[PDB]
Nucleic acid binder design. Sequence first.
RNA 1: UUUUUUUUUU
Length: 714
Amino acid sequence: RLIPPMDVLHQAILEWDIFHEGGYRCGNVSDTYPDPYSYKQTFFPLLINEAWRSFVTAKDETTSKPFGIKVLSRMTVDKFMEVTAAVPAQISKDRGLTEGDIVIISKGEDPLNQPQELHCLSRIWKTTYKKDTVEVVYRLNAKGNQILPALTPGSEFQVVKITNMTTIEREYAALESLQYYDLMDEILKAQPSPMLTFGDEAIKAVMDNYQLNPGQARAILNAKENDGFTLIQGPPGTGKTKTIVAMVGCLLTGVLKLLVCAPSNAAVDELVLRLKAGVKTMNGTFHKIEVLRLGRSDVINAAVKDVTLDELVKARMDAELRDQLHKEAGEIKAKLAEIRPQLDAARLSDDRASAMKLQREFDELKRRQAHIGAKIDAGNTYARETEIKRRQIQQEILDKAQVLCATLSGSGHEMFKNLNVEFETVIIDEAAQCVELSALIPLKYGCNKCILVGDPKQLPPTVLSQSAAKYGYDQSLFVRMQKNHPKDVHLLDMQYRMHPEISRFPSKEFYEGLLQDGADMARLRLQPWHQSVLLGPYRFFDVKGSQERGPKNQSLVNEEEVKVAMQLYMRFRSDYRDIDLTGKIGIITPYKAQLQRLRQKFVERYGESITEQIEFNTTDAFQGRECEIIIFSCVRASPTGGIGFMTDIRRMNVGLTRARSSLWILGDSRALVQGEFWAKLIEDAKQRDRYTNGNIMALLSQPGPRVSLESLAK
RNA sequence: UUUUUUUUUU
Ligand SMILES: Nc1ncnc2c1ncn2[C@@H]1O[C@H](COP(=O)(O)OP(=O)(O)O)[C@@H](O)[C@H]1O
């Protein structure tokens, strides 16, 4: 049984005043723990802090238009006040009211901006669709609530949906049920299985069978042999997804269940798409295995909806599947409406036979109407049987699937509480991008083998709480395990994405010179526009500009960098007209206001069609993805006060390692020198002749110089 | 040295 009581968490959350900016005892995170008690004492307050800051952010950011509810009933359940309330069905569907949402119920008309009004924090417990109404079961804290005497039956209130706490509930569930985990010892001690050394012959055999390099084959062999935690660190372009697919085939060699998880839906979708192509066992046989995606069809790729469990169950139930009775009733009533005036006229004119016939027809129509009305009154048992058939179909589909892919929170769904399933082996992708409690979620189903593919050198998980991030809540389990046992981590050491000039600096400065380029990589990234000196594989443009707060005091904008980016795109496109660039260019900037300004100006000049040829994004919203050419706007321009979160080397590495063929960086050096590694990058660009300064708008206004003929020979 | 930034939710 792995269903802990959610009373404590719900009470802690419902005992909050919404009007504060922004309990508990938040401490630092240790490397190891002796007992689940210490683990809980460390991580529960940090979870509460993260939840609190997420709630404040969602309150300030939400824009759900309020709506009126009618209080139908009030009850006391546990230590909570339960209020059933009626809501219009269309309003409910528009605002998406489901079980677990956090809402503000107020008496005033604008609840979000009326603290002095009768307000309360409530959690949705059940949503029941009747006909044109929705019965919502709100649950609030029964200790100290202003609206408690005012929620009498019939009283009307105004509600606004703030956020949802399903993810928090699942992470708390995993936290409280950790004490029964098969891998509890390894999770507490952060101890992965020891590094295995294999013979070069078996390594070469795996390489030949799966078309892998030595590091990937070593990682796969250690994932097949070792039990417990196996850590695989995959720098950019090292082949993480290919390794995972070959590893899934390798583990299923015997079977021919396996739970592949990722923190985001995008990574899950990529893994599903790659596993749909098919795996191959170590025997060398190609098998099109059964890949099953778990999640709602709204956050799921259009290409993987063919293998989504929900879609499969819906398709199966659509074959087994009162309104015709209503149609016939309408038609018989129309016949009655026809017959009645005819009968009245035949009776008002002393027409014996005609009135007799019409009365006979009238009586037959009334008989049919009574029959249809009796049948209409004839469930709910059919609905229950449909739900039972749904459950059966779910189980039957799950039992035939060999690999199940999911998000971390999605793998802790309530569904599995009524489905007999165990996941012996779990592979967590993007292992360094999720907090520890999220990683623990898929491990409650009897997992004794966990392969963590990640990269702590890139971005950490989103921790809105600056205090919890300072306490160490932004540390993934991967990071702690590698912190304690670094020699047991399998590093993928060969990248196949960046031109050697692009990868040169990150490899040395972030991967200790251990990230080597693949064979024939410079020749693979050879592009025609590299013949232009200023359009080479890698370059830093010292765009001396000025930073400025975005609209509504958002983030930062550098209009000169936007102008230079437009000028660079114009020069490149004009000097190379015959190159198909659709989907080959990306423009990334770590500040959202600069991103919006870049998109705005590019659409002003080139129209909305420009977004099909250029991927506009922020540095954080680009991880895992890549483009042929990357224009990187640094935005920061104030020579004092630092460069903000530009100082974090993980974000810098992510931003530098997105490009394949060309990376063109635009930054005001006078400000960026404040950061140590940005200074090192600018100096490196200088001492290798990849730095350009002066009037950049003028240097890009004309077609620029070409590279020497002798350099192209080599 | 003024975090302003991202995942998650049947
Ligand atoms: N041994 C290899 N030889 C040649 N190319 C490889 C090898 N391993 C990986 N690659 C290339 O690297 C790519 C890795 O894809 P992906 O897993 O998305 O990279 P990332 O590690 O950035 O997620 C593959 O598409 C493949 O073309």
